[PDB]
Structure 1
Amino acid sequence: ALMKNPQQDSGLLSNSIDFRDQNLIFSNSGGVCTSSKDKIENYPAKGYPYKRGVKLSFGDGTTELEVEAGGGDDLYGVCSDIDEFSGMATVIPITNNFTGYLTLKKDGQNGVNPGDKLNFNQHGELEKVKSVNAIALSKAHKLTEDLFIVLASVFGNR
């Protein structure tokens, strides 16, 4: 939900006996298939833009710029990880292609299928289709009653 790691603890020990379908957790930060030649930036975080499209947000001028969840014509990058202690968000610029699990809008998530074109909304959530090239590679997976994640590949601007 609002935390990459589960906020509550657990009363059970993991079996760790199977190897299939174990990467669906929300704490799976970063990309599924990553290159060593990827440019990675870090920014101050406004809100929780984790696993969402991030856009630049400024202030009066007393403080430095930061990144907040958003998209459309103001999209700047995609957030893949967050350090909570320092309040820092890891950003992959839109000029660098990314492939991984991203938050999907809970509206028509069943209609999302591999090969369906996606775009970022005003809240940084992926939605089925403008100006950004993003393609779904799997189907929506439900983590919470309002939280859905989809494997997507974003490869620049249209």
Structure 2
Amino acid sequence: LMKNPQQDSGLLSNSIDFRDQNLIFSNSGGVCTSSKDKIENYPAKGYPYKRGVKLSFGDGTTELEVEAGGGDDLYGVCSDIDEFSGMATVIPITNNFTGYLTLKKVNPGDKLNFNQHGELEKVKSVNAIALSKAHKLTEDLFIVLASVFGNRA
């Protein structure tokens, strides 16, 4: 529910090895990032971190927001959150993305689609291919390296 662990740790983390130190929930952004990527931000409704987002509209008093969602309403991928301001960094669905995303509770090369809650699931209208296997971080939190190529016909 939080980008960083909510409870403080009690142990100094030894930094000796250099392998498999990136399979954490705090890894924001993408593994490969271009300096020509288009980056937006929107007010967040809920916690859409590491999830696909859609646009949500209220009465009309306040501006639009982004909420976790997929299907035919998919607008992009949320890659970072600023908690103080409620800001959600969004990469549009028309821009290539490669990074770790939340997976529904799967082998590399398997086609993926975003479900109603913005979670990737194995297969229809979006190009998403898993580049690794599901890594479990919590009882109900599974992440996976995926690449999004846009919408298919």
Q: Gaps spanning 5+ residues in structure 1: where?
A: 107-111
Q: Distance in 2 between matches of 1:11 and 1:132?
A: 42
Give the structure-1-normalised TM-score.
0.96
**Partner of residue 82, structure 2:** 83
1:134 to 128, 132, 137: 128
Query: Quick one: distance in 1 between partners of 2:24 and 2:125?
Result: 30
Q: Which runs of 4+ in 1 moved over 3 A?
A: none
Equivalences for residues 21-36 of structure 1 within 5 A = 21-36=20-35
CA root-mean-square deviation? 0.4
- In 2: Cα distance, 1:136 partner to 1:26 partner: 17
Partner of 2:64: 65
Aligned residues, how many? 152
Return 5+ residue gaps in structure 2 as ranges.
Answer: none
Deviation, 1:54, is 0.2
Aligned-residue sequence identity (percent) comes to: 100
Deviation of 1:46 after TM superposition, in Å, equals: 0.2
TM-score with structure 2 setting the length: 0.99
SS in 2 for 1:36: coil
> For 1:135 and 1:55, how far apart are their aligned partners in 2?
20
Question: 1:52-90 CA deviation, whole Å, 9 max, x = no partner?
Answer: 000000001000000000000000000000000000000
- For 2:9 and 2:51, how far apart are their aligned partners in 1? 27
Instruction: Give how far 1:125 is off.
Output: 0.1
Report the CA distance between 1:7 and its aligned residue: 0.5
Distance 1:14 1:67 in 2: 35
Query: For 2:79, what is the secondary structure of its paired residue?
Result: strand
